[PDB]
Amino acid sequence: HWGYGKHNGPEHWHKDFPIAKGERQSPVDIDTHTAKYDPSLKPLSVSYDQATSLRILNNGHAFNVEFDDSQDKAVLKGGPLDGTYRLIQFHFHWGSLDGQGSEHTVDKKKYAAELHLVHWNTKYGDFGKAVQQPDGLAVLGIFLKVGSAKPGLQKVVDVLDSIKTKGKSADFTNFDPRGLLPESLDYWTYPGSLTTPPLLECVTWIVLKEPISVSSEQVLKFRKLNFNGEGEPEELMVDNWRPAQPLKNRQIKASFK
Ligand SMILES: [Zn+2]
Secondary structure, eight states: OOOSSTTTSTTTHHHHOGGGGSSSOSOOEEOTTTSEEOTTOOOEEEEOTTOOEEEEEEOSSSEEEEEOOSSSSSEEEETTOOSOEEEEEEEEEEOSSTTOOOSSEETTBOOSEEEEEEEEEGGGSSHHHHTTSTTSEEEEEEEEEESSOOGGGHHHHHHGGGGOSBTOEEEOOSOOGGGGOOSOOOEEEEEEOOSSTTOOSOEEEEEESSOEEEOHHHHHHHTTOBSSBTTSOOOBOOOOOOOOOOOOSOOOEESOO
């Protein structure tokens, strides 16, 4: 099926998922000098105090840290968002080298990786219904650069050896996602899509201006994961990112000057 290789990567997705060439595809390049400051944007409200993590899974494309979203335990509100969006999972996209890995770019600059905290609009009842709406999801994107280690990420790094291959999962309770955020919540926002098939155009993207720093040792462990399943020929899980897509008829707004 779809992947990130030469024969099943981003260049091939449109054949099975024609929306890949759609009206509001993601990611995109954020031209900082074209984005418009919007003084009407309310402050971003990240409420992860009651977040309940449950499990970490290698799905063959990346690894997902899943949360209990049966209640408003961990939510994202404010900013360009109307209503309440519940955290369901987070995952990353990274490269084979420190010079690439992020999906969104800033003035064409590629970061080592990108963290995506996925939330769905509670007005729609469940995640499956939400992805069918233009304002169904809100994904908080955070860039990762290589420098000093991120203490709040180590717990994630330590468990990767237990989910090396596709289909593997491990219990991952009591993890605090607040430890993955930068100091500032300044952000850019625009209407987009899921960056992986089915590429549904149901996402309000909120990309933070300030990247978080992770150590070389931490990202190296991400690169030891496998796209393949147990017993199969090893395919290192690297460069699982979709390149920037045409902005087309869209405007990127900034929460800061
Ligand atoms: Zn993602």
